[PDB]
Amino acid sequence: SMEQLKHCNGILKELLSKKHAAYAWPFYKPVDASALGLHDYHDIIKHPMDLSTVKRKMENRDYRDAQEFAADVRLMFSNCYKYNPPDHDVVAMARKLQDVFEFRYAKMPD
Numbered sequence: 001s002m003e004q005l006k007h008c009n010g011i012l013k014e015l016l017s018k019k020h021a022a023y024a025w026p027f028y029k030p031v032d033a034s035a036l037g038l039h040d041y042h043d044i045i046k047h048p049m050d051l052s053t054v055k056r057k058m059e060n061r062d063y064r065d066a067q068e069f070a071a072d073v074r075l076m077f078s079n080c081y082k083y084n085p086p087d088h089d090v091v092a093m094a095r096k097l098q099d100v101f102e103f104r105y106a107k108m109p110d
């Protein structure tokens with residue numbers, strides 16, 4: 001619905017807000033494989049995703065429903081878990097931001 005997509009825009013605003021910056025910063029823009037020295041990133045990760053891409057899709061009304069929005073946000077986190085070992089600090093940062101996302105997404109009115 002239009003109303004659920006409105007709640008999703010509020011979730012995205014929360015994920016981009018200053019209170020989460022200490023763990024959100026790796027996710028604001030696409031992974032820059034050249035800058036980071038990740039020569040195999042685009043071989044391993046076939047469908048990159050990040051918050052700037054989710055924001056553009058929300059602004060252009062490209063999500064048909066709330067579930068399509070959730071699939072892109074979960075894809076962003078899944079790519080991080082897929083690429084990195086489980087002991088890495090970026091994985092701990094992803095799980096902190098994901099817990100914000102999953103809590104707010106669960107509270108969406110029907």
Ligand SMILES: COc1ccc2c(c1)C(c1ccc(Cl)cc1)=N[C@@H](CC(=O)N1CCC(N(C)C)CC1)c1nnc(C)n1-2
Nearest residue numbers: 025026027030031032036038079080083084085089090093
């Ligand atoms: C703008 O900076 C970014 C953007 C995307 C990143 C990363 C950093 C940060 C990053 C690293 C440390 C901290 Cl504390 C935070 C983030 N990691 C990269 C991954 C990275 O560089 N690795 C891969 C693992 C290697 N092991 C030695 C095995 C080291 C190099 C990354 N992956 N998903 C996202 C999103 N990312």
